[PDB]
Design a protein around this nucleic acid. Structure first.
Lengths: 98, 50, 154, 50
DNA sequence: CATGGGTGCGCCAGACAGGG
DNA sequence: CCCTGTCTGGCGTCCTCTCACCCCATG
């Protein structure tokens, strides 16, 4: 009933953090849809490295941001507070749309 | 009750130094009015004088 | 000409008082002395004879009229009667804050688990009658949808 | 405090305060949408007696 | 589920009418 | 106004030891 869309840069972190966000829900709400991954946005910035001439030495960079969905089933007040207020993992965005 | 004859914010917390439920379960921040339900943070005999 | 009067009943048995009142009218057949009965107070279109006064106070679970005196009880000094009548109809179909929550406007939450929290409405939906406002939970503004009456304009 | 069984044996002052607050809420409602003079005279009189 | 409204005591004493 | 009758209020011993029972009612 409530889309839980959460974003973070590390994949071993965003996917660790999705294990407890349903463990704090299935303990009380006892019904979640399931962990849905989403296609990651890879932003590339390839740019020069020398402070002058030699525009042939560049270094390819990439910042990968990931997205996960769990889309919890039950809108019972208990479950609402157990996710809305109980947000964990600093450095991990989580945004909810009921 | 949230704001009834026996309120939390108007008087005080039933339990000593416990705010309300999930907030302050040790002895460090005695006073912070938690957002879950407006409540004071004091002892058990504080409601007898208020 | 039949003027209005206010009757006090035991609050909670009011529909049964209204039914028993209509039945006492059609028992003691003073049909030309009663017009309607509107619904803890029961409104009665009536005239004032002492016989009809004893009739209404002999209806069971009725305390008495409410007026200036008990000799000649008082019709209807309408002061906020029109307001109450209009408010009933208005409530039937009408919003509280009228979703005046525009984008970037701060609002207040007093319902659900987000009760006692403020936030801003990033998006508004007058058609769906829902405001998109996020409430700083543990610092993280938790974008949640609240109704106009569920939240107050800040 | 409750008794042996569990039903709360409530004090008399809670009945008195709960009556005064019920009537005061009714009288404030009879100030917003409100109602005619005879109604608010009985309402204020019931609050006075409460 | 939650709220909503008897008729056997006797003296003192002072305040409120009530004549006087 | 100066006395007379009425009308309501205020009050009546101290410690203990068991028991029994604490708001219906219902659309």
């Amino acid at each position: 009933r409530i889309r839980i869309r959460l974003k973070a840069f590390d994949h071993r972190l965003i996917d660790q953090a999705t294990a407890e966000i349903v463990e704090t829900a299935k303990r009380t709400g006892a019904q979640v849809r399931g962990p849905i991954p989403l296609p990651t946005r890879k932003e590339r910035f390839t740019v020069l490295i020398s402070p002058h001439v030699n525009k042939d030495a560049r270094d390819q960079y990439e910042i990968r941001t990931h997205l996960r969905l769990v889309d919890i089933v039950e809108p019972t007040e208990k479950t609402v507070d157990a996710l809305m207020r109980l947000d964990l993992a600093a450095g991990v965005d989580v945004q909810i749309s009921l | 009750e949230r704001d009834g004859l026996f309120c939390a914010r108007i008087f005080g917390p039933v339990k000593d130094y416990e705010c309300l439920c999930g907030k302050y379960k040790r002895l460090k921040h005695r006073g912070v009015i938690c957002e879950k339900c407006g409540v004071e943070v004091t002892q058990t005999k504080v409601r007898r004088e208020r | 000409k039949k003027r209005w009067y206010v009757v006090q009943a035991f609050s909670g048995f009011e529909g049964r008082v209204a039914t028993s009142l209509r039945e006492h009218i059609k028992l003691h057949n003073m049909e030309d002395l009663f017009g309607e009965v509107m619904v803890g107070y029961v409104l009665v279109q009536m005239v004032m004879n002492d016989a009809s006064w004893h009739l209404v106070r002999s209806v069971p679970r009725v305390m008495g009229f409410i007026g200036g005196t008990s000799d000649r009880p008082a019709p209807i000094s309408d002061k906020e009667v029109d307001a109450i009548m209009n408010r009933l109809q208005q409530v039937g179909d009408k919003p509280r804050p009228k979703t005046l929550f525009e984008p970037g406007e701060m609002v207040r939450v007093n319902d659900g688990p987000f009760a006692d929290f403020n936030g801003v409405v990033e998006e508004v939906d007058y058609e769906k009658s829902r405001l998109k406002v996020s409430v700083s939970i543990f610092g993280r503004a938790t974008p949640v949808e609240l109704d106009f009456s569920q939240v107050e304009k800040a | 405090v409750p008794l042996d069984g569990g039903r709360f044996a409530t004090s008399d002052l809670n009945d008195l305060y709960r009556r005064v607050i019920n009537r005061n809420n009714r009288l404030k409602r009879l100030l917003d949408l409100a109602a005619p003079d005879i109604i608010v005279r009985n309402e204020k009189r019931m609050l006075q007696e409460a």
